[PDB]
């Protein structure tokens, strides 16, 4: 009796939320930007090709200087590349070879990694002796680590396979905040420009907005049909983009609290593994399982370009802070810079 | 100036490349195996005979290194992390003896996944003695869960062990054919299945994998020259 009426109340609340969202929807994004000049054909070329990794690449992260980047490979390796000269800076072996994510600190003095070992390893790059050693090993997650992003040199936000997210405090080893509410595996997280909020997508075809300080879920966004594998914030921070296994990408607005635009095509069947925005947010870059990457016009939902240089699936891609180039990794153990 | 910094960068790069060459030489000489069980399959005893989300075990057979990984502290939803094992040497799938239907469903999902379609599976039908004693007792039957066992006939290619009654031989060969049908329903020469009648305490099991992976490697070589 209690469960049935609780479910009825939850259904009524969902009906009210959907009614409010429908009432707030007066016009679509397609007709608003129908009068603007289309972006036209765009063509990017491969300028650099990073070689040296033995196994498939799982994650990459650009540094704040838009020059140094970090790459993670399941051979058990973290490699720091200088994209300008292609020279390798640091080669860090990993205790666990099943790495799935890597992070670069904004200050550039630390790096992070994690994977099937359920342990977030933080390595110091500016050691006195010059060698790279593990600075911290945060433990407590009961699932595989999927993503991690630094807030500062002493705080980090991580996502795990235990359907929960964590906010840790370095130099103590204890997670100060726990975010719960997801039912599926959390696959990716994206920090807002003000760092106050962050969006995380899970395997329940839903994304959730979490406030870092207080630590509750503020908004929940649905609309995808399969697991969400990628997420990225808009440059202005009032919206975000999600890529899922349903071969579609979606744009959600924080203030509108509903989906704004869907990017898909009939010939695209494979899912989306990575996604990111450009400097101005006009172009949306998404990595696909068909060994190719698609650049879409975010305002008009029109495909603007195709980046095809990888012989295997694209697992990760990122855009520099200045927006001068885009780095794409793939399972073929190669990283490519496109400009 | 630019010259000194670039020279230091070249020196660090060449040292890194030398270390990576040594690491690649080490890495290409070892085989990685993914150990998976359907539940209460007894693979823990096999591990004993040779928190943290994964466990590692390294063993040498005939001067050949093998690194087997067992998943621990991971939720029952395997559809995401299993993709990390798409380039291992083989997946050792242990099946006890309706848990059998669930094991068959897991094997069908592993067999038909896009990332694992070129990965071979070594099947270990563990607890042969338990199945033999259950068949001899007769209290538990397979026809209630698998009616097709009523019309099943022992294949002419069967090689039963001496002293084994025909009933247990028929039951174990029917269980093997249950997985064989799924394995042969797909996988047109890209991957193969190696069923084995094993117990949790046999010392030959380590040999068995050694006899399977080698075969796989040979087939892979035969795929490189377009001979098979």
């Amino acid at each position: 009796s209690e469960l049935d009426q609780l479910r009825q109340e939850a259904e009524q609340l969902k009906n009210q939320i959907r009614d409010a969202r429908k009432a707030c929807a007066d016009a679509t994004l397609s007709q608003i930007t129908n009068n603007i000049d289309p972006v036209g054909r765009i063509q990017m070329r491969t300028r650099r090709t990073l070689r040296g990794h033995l196994a498939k690449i799982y994650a990459m992260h650009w540094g704040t200087d838009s020059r140094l980047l970090v790459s993670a490979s399941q051979d058990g390796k973290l490699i720091i590349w200088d994209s300008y000269t292609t020279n390798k800076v640091h080669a860090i072996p990993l205790r666990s070879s099943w790495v799935m994510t890597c992070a670069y600190a904004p200050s550039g003095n630390y790096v992070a990694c994690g994977g099937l070992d359920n342990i977030c390893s933080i390595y110091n790059l500016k050691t006195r002796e010059g060698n790279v050693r593990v600075s911290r090993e945060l433990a407590g997650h009961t699932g595989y680590l999927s993503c991690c992003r630094f807030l500062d040199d002493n705080q980090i936000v991580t996502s795990s396979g235990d359907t929960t997210c964590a906010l840790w405090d370095i130099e103590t080893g204890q997670q100060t905040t726990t975010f719960t509410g997801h039912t599926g595996d959390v696959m990716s997280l994206s920090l807002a420009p003000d760092t106050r909020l962050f969006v995380s997508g899970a395997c329940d075809a839903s994304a959730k907005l979490w406030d870092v300080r207080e630590g509750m879920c503020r908004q929940t966004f649905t609309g995808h049909e399969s697991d969400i594998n990628a997420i990225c914030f808009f440059p202005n921070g009032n919206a975000f983009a999600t890529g899922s296994d349903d071969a579609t990408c979606r744009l959600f607005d924080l203030r509108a609290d509903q989906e704004l635009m869907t990017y898909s095509h009939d010939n695209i069947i494979c899912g989306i593994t990575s996604v990111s925005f450009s400097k101005s947010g006009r172009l949306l870059l998404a990595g696909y399982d068909d060994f190719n990457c698609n650049v879409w016009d975010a305002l008009k939902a029109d495909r603007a370009g195709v980046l095809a240089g990888h012989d295997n699936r694209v697992s990760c891609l990122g855009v520099t802070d200045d927006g001068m180039a885009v780095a794409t990794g793939s399972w073929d153990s190669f990283l490519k810079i496109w400009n | 100036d630019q010259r000194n910094e670039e020279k230091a960068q070249r020196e660090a790069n060449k040292k890194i490349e030398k270390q990576l060459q040594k690491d690649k030489q080490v890495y290409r000489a070892t085989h990685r195996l993914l150990l998976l069980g359907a539940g209460e399959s007894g693979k823990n005893t096999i591990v004993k005979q040779m928190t943290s989300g994964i466990f590692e075990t390294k063993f040498q057979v005939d001067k050949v290194n093998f690194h087997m990984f067992d998943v621990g502290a991971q939720r029952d939803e395997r559809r995401k992390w299993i993709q990390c094992f798409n380039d291992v040497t083989a997946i050792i799938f242990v099946v006890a003896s309706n848990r059998l239907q669930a094991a068959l469903k897991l094997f069908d999902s592993i067999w038909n996944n896009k990332w694992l379609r070129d990965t071979s599976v070594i099947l270990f039908l563990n607890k042969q003695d338990l199945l033999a004693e259950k068949v001899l007792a007769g209290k538990s039957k397979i026809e209630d869960y698998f009616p097709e066992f009523a019309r099943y006939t022992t294949p002419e290619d069967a090689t039963p062990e001496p002293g084994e009654d025909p009933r247990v031989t028929r039951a174990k060969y029917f269980i093997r054919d249950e997985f064989l049908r799924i394995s042969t329903a797909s996988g047109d020469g890209r991957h193969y299945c190696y069923p084995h009648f094993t117990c949790s305490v046999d010392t030959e099991n380590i040999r068995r994998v050694f006899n399977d992976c080698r075969d796989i490697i040979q087939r892979m070589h035969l795929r490189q020259y377009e001979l098979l």
Partner: nanobody
Framework: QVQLQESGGGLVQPGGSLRLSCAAS????????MNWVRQAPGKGLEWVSD????????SYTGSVKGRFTISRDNAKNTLYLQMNSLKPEDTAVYYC?????????????????????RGQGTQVTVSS
């Protein structure tokens, strides 16, 4: 929003018949492979039957091979399970489940304890 609603079931005498229905919304039902599973009291979730996207590929478990019949209709975005010659061993909560990804041959995690793409099943009791 992916939504699955189960209808039908109840208390039936032994040897009776029943028709369970599964209504799907929030996704393209025509390109997903569907499953019927059950959870018996004091027991874990058990897979019962499955049907492909077009309905050509149909499979059942051994215990209901000759008794249950699974079907789908894409026009009304619906799924049906016809159960005949019911026995007290069939008393369980039945769930209608969807595969995590479309255009995908295999189907993972449908029998897991927590699964997002699974609705609230209906109770079927067989007793006199």
């Amino acid at each position: 929003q992916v939504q699955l609603q189960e209808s039908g079931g109840g208390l039936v005498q032994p040897g009776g018949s029943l028709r369970l229905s599964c209504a799907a919304s929030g996704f393209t039902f025509s390109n997903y492979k569907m499953n019927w599973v059950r959870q018996a009291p004091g027991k874990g979730l058990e897979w019962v039957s499955d049907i492909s996207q077009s309905g050509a590929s149909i499979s059942y478990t051994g215990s209901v091979k000759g008794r249950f019949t699974i079907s789908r209709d894409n026009a009304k975005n619906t799924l049906y399970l016809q159960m005949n010659s019911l026995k007290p061993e069939d008393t369980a909560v039945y769930y209608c489940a969807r595969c995590p990804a479309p255009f995908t041959r295999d189907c993972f995690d449908v029998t897991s304890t927590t699964y997002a793409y699974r609705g609230q099943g209906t109770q079927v009791t067989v007793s006199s």
